[PDB]
Design a protein around this nucleic acid. Structure first.
Lengths: 109, 174, 190, 65, 245
RNA sequence: GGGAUGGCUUGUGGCGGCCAAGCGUUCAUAGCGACGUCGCUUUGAUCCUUCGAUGUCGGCUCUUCCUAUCAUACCGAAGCAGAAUUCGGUAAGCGUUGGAUUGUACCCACUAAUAGGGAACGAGCUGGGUUUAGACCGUCGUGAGACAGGUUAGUUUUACCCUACUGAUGAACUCGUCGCAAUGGUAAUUCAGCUUAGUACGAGAGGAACCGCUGAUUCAGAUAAUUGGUUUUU
RNA sequence: UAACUGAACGUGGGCGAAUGUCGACACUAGUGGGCCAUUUUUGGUAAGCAGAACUGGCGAUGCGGGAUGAACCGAACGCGGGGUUAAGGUGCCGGAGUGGACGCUCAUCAGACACCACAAAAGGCGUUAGUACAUCUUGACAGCAGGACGGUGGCCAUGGAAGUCGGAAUCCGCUAAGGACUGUGUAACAACUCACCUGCCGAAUGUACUAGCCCUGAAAAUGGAUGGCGCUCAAGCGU
């Protein structure tokens, strides 16, 4: 049956009350030996993109392919000296990781 | 639709005190007999005017015979027929010797080619093409050609169906 | 629609003899004589004019009218075969293994035979038996070329197609392997 | 979903909280920024289920604004 | 009639002209008549007709029409009852085949002298007679096909090799070079494109155009001219020889 | 005492909003709408989120059918160089295995491949659903007992009948010998090695194929010279 | 009723549409919330479907035809003879036409009992008949032989980008006509080609719809079904 109360807000709360409730409830979660009383009647519902940006700025078609317009690579170095340092530390990290994996006929099931 | 005849059917509304002399309406109807002719008259008249059989009368029914049935003529038939889509026009032409023969050939041809029955074909106009350049369809433009002489290849001879066995193989050249 | 009469015409040169008997056409000229049975198509032949063959169909449909063009082109091709002849020049190319083509005349069957060896290093010997009337010649003017000559266009072209289709690269990239025998030129002998 | 307000077939179905077509549910609309005339957050609003969840595997609803 | 050729719709900007182009041609021809003293009829038969732009540029004060022959004839007026000016129906008898109109105010002697000494070497079209024998030498195929010495010629482009094979030259692709026979010019004879005193077909003329060999000439031949003052048509030398209708 | 949906189904979501060929529509200018599109349902991560048996399936042996093709045969396309493939098409001729795990369906290996179904699930044998009578524990009940349940042990036992199948005889036509073939069945299968050839192809790493030859897998039909097995040759 | 002024009931007298042709008791039953079908009405569903009202049939029922059959069509039944039909049929099984006229269709399991589903505004370079619009001797569609140009390598961008890797604009001249370009192609050019125009030719075409028949529009599992053979100017489809 049509009724006016279908199109009204059913639960409302103010800014300061919501903030105080959240702060007090967070302080209650800080203690694991303190539990609520009548938790079923409490408003617990109130308590409880880099990839997208890169794809938006540069599409896959403009990156690589027959219609690609990409011409300038994205680098982590600026001049030749930091390029040499980057290569040196990259080789050192690669060798260290390989030694770590080495330290860490098929096998039986 | 059977051996058809053409009928002049004149009918009118029944005279009342308001209208002592009602208008007379005349139609040319291709029907097998006079009962069907008057029925088609009342159907077409109900389709056009405020006259029906209970409020009107049939003044005259006369058979319209062809003036020259021995003269080969070309006829143009303009017609409307009902399909599952709706009403459609066709103009067709038939080389016959009379209007009733042309209409019978039209009914057979429309039944064969578009599966349209007598109930769903309206004959709007049947005319005689008095000159040769009035012929438009190629299948009669090829018949009105000058010096039309053709053979009849592969004529199966007319052999009686009760004579089961023949002693020689028939020829198809006569 | 059934068309009452439809006609085609074939001009005939002076050196050609055409004999038609129960839709069996026999065309004889300077180079030779060919025969073809056209009894599967309903057509009436006549002599409309001197040196003119007339083909006519009566009370035929559009398909029956259109078949006369095929009959006309077939008889014209027979006339061109007995007057000028037909010649297909084919070239066989190779990348690494030289393709060896030998041509001989099997006299017992009266027909030419072509043997193909070393096609992409294969040890098999491919053999193509010609249709009778087709003569095979290894061309001396150009390099790695066969010449097929004859009076029958169908026989010469079918022999050429057999030579193309017996040398097909299998299970390889056709962009990379371009070996084979291909029909380079089609034309008349005279 | 906060609660099931009315299942039109049977009050027992509403007591059991059954989500079928035409069921009025109460949803937390805190993520839509519906606000009262003075600044109070409207965090509960009715909505109607407009699909068949038992045949669709999901609950689709329309707000009763 | 289900079995029919699929009519290809063209996704290009330029459309069919139609009747409006013919009406525009009628208006242009019928408006250039009362401004120029002489109207010449010229003929360019079996010619490429691509130097007409240079002719139009060189004769800036002249007006040249090179439309349809029957359209130009009906624009000038075929019968004396429909002619725009007197004597134009006499001029319309020369408009057959590939012809053109030249409206001018210059001296007819000057026009005849200019179209006499005007001559540019041009590629031959199909139907012309070959003036000499052209043969591509065996070996590496160059751009001119032996017209210039081979030491001063770039090799022909590798993309033209399928076109040469389709046009009948038995060339082949060796090491990115289009070669006739072998790389060192062995095991093959030269390819004779044309023989002297032989009617050129489209295949031979296209081969000569690819090899940039010109075996013809571009000659404009004046047939006659109508003068507005005298109201008469003076017939020139080529007009007697060329058929009239 | 009475019983024991079906020319159904398959490959592509819902809700809500735009766009739109079109269908309608001219005294109302509304309404449906294919094709699409848009919102909700981790920078190759995490392994610290497995979400309820009322409905029951398996296994052995053996035969046949379907194709909705895993492999073998052939073919078309793809940066498909070669090698290895991927996608698709015709095709059921021929194959499609051996095991582990019951604190209760997935792993491992061989292999060319370990494709999916029907004829049951709209009185052959054998393990669970599954449950007569004995007994125990858990839950419920004052109780007899019942069950949210868990465990143990536990009676159906033809064929000589007709048909079908598999084989074996057979009257009538004197007996016998040698034959013909209508019809019915039908059979082969896959892999490896030598040569081609370390060749074609390739920057290198690598690395084919046709013809030819020799074995092997599975199936089938025989056979007992030899080798094992069998011994009432008592 | 102011009143033989009216109201009933009697006395006496005079004088009606068509078509077809029973009532009351007594006694005794069986069945009285069954099935199917047309039409109408009310609710819905993804689709099925669920209700009522009248009528007809069946349970109780044979016969002819639907190959066969509870619900269909015709027609209801004593025992026989002769004649004629209904529904349905006439190539053979099967009694009766390889009957007549005009057309359509060729299906790699057509169709001959369809309407329902598949299923859609569905896909067909199958074949006929039409409707609308357009071109055409001032030469239509298709072809063949040629042109297809200049500013200009337009602007930005790019290592390079010149119509043809990209973004935005997309004008003018010479025109008979030619896009700041339709594809092939080059590292970029070049080159070829398309749109468009002219020359040869010779008379009818092009586009989109509509209506018929045909193909596909989804199928499992023993070997089989317009009833069977078989049928192709039908022994199929429409009149």
């Amino acid at each position: 049956e049509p009724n006016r109360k279908w199109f009204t807000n059913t639960r409302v709360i103010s800014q300061d009350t919501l903030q105080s409730f959240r702060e007090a409830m967070a302080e209650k979660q800080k203690d694991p030996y303190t539990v609520l009383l009548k938790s079923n009647k409490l408003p617990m519902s109130l308590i409880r993109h880099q990839a997208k940006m890169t794809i938006e700025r540069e599409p896959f078609s403009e990156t690589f392919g027959p219609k690609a317009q990409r011409k300038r690579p994205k680098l982590s170095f600026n001049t030749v000296d930091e390029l040499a340092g980057y290569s040196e530390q990259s080789l050192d990290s690669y060798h260290a990781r390989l030694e770590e994996k080495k330290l860490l006929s098929v096998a039986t099931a | 639709m059977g051996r058809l005849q053409e009928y002049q059917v004149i009918g009118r509304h029944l005279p009342t005190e308001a209208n002592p002399n009602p208008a007379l309406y005349r139609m040319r109807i291709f029907a097998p007999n006079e009962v069907v002719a008057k029925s088609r008259f009342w159907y077409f008249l109900r389709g056009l005017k405020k006259v029906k059989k209970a409020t009107g009368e049939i003044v005259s029914v006369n058979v319209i015979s062809e003036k020259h049935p021995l003269k080969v003529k070309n006829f143009g038939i303009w017609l409307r027929y009902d399909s599952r889509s709706g009403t459609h026009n066709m103009y067709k032409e038939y080389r016959e010797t009379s209007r009733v023969a042309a209409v019978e050939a039209m009914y057979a041809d429309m039944a064969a080619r578009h599966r349209a029955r007598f109930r769903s074909i309206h004959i709007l106009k049947v005319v005689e093409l008095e000159k040769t350049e009035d012929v438009k369809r190629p299948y009669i433009k090829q018949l009105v050609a000058k010096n039309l002489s053709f053979p009849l290849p592969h004529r199966v001879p007319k052999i009686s169906t009760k004579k089961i066995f023949s002693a020689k193989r028939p020829s198809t050249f006569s | 629609m059934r068309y009452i009469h439809s006609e085609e015409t074939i001009p005939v040169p002076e050196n050609v003899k055409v004999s038609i008997k129960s839709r069996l056409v026999t065309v004889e000229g300077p180079r030779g004589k060919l025969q073809k049975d056209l009894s599967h198509i309903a057509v009436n032949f006549s002599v409309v004019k001197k040196g003119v063959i007339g083909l006519e169909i009566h009370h035929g449909s559009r398909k029956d009218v259109a078949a006369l063009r095929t009959v006309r082109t077939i008889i014209n091709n027979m006339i061109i075969g007995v007057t000028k002849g037909f010649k297909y020049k084919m070239r066989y190319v190779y990348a690494h293994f030289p393709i060896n083509v030998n041509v001989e005349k099997n006299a017992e069957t009266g027909c030419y035979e072509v043997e193909i060896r070393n096609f992409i290093g294969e040890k098999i010997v491919r053999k193509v038996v010609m249709a009778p009337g087709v003569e095979v010649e290894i061309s001396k003017a150009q390099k790695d070329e066969l010449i097929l000559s004859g009076n029958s266009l169908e026989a010469v072209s079918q022999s050429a197609a057999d030579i193309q289709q017996i040398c097909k690269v299998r299970n390889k990239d056709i962009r990379k392997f371009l070996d084979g025998i291909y029909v380079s030129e089609k034309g008349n002998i005279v | 979903i906060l609660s099931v307000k009315k299942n039109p077939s049977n009050p027992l179905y509403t007591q059991l909280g059954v989500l079928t077509k035409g069921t009025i549910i109460e949803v937390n609309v805190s993520d839509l920024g519906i606000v009262t005339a003075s600044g109070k957050i409207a965090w509960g609003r009715y909505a109607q289920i407009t699909n068949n969840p038992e045949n669709d595997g999901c609950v689709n609803a329309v707000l009763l604004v | 009639p289900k079995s029919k050729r699929a009519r290809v719709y063209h996704l290009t900007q330029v459309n069919k002209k139609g009747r409006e182009a013919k009406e525009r041609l009628f208006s242009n021809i019928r408006e250039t008549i009362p401004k120029y003293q002489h109207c010449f009829v010229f003929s360019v038969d079996n010619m490429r007709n691509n130097y007409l732009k240079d002719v139009r540029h060189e004769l800036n004060d002249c007006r040249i029409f090179f439309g349809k022959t029957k359209l130009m004839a009906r624009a000038l007026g075929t019968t004396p009852e429909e002619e725009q000016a007197d004597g134009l129906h006499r001029l319309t008898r020369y408009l057959t085949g590939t012809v053109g109109l030249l409206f001018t105010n210059r001296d007819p002697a000057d026009i005849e002298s200019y179209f006499s000494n005007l001559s540019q070497v041009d590629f031959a079209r199909a139907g012309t007679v070959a003036p000499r024998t052209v043969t591509v030498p065996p070996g590496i195929v160059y751009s001119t096909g032996g017209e210039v010495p081979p030491e001063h010629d770039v090799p022909v482009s590798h993309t033209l090799e399928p076109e040469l094979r389709r046009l009948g030259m038995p060339v082949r692709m060796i090491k990115g070079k289009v070669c006739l026979g072998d790389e060192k010019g062995e095991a093959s004879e030269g390819y004779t494109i044309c023989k002297e005193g032989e009617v050129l077909d489209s295949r031979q003329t296209r081969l000569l155009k690819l090899f940039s060999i010109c075996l013809s000439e571009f000659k404009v031949s004046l047939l006659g001219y109508w003068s507005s003052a005298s109201g008469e048509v003076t017939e020139l030398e080529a007009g007697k020889t060329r058929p009239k209708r």
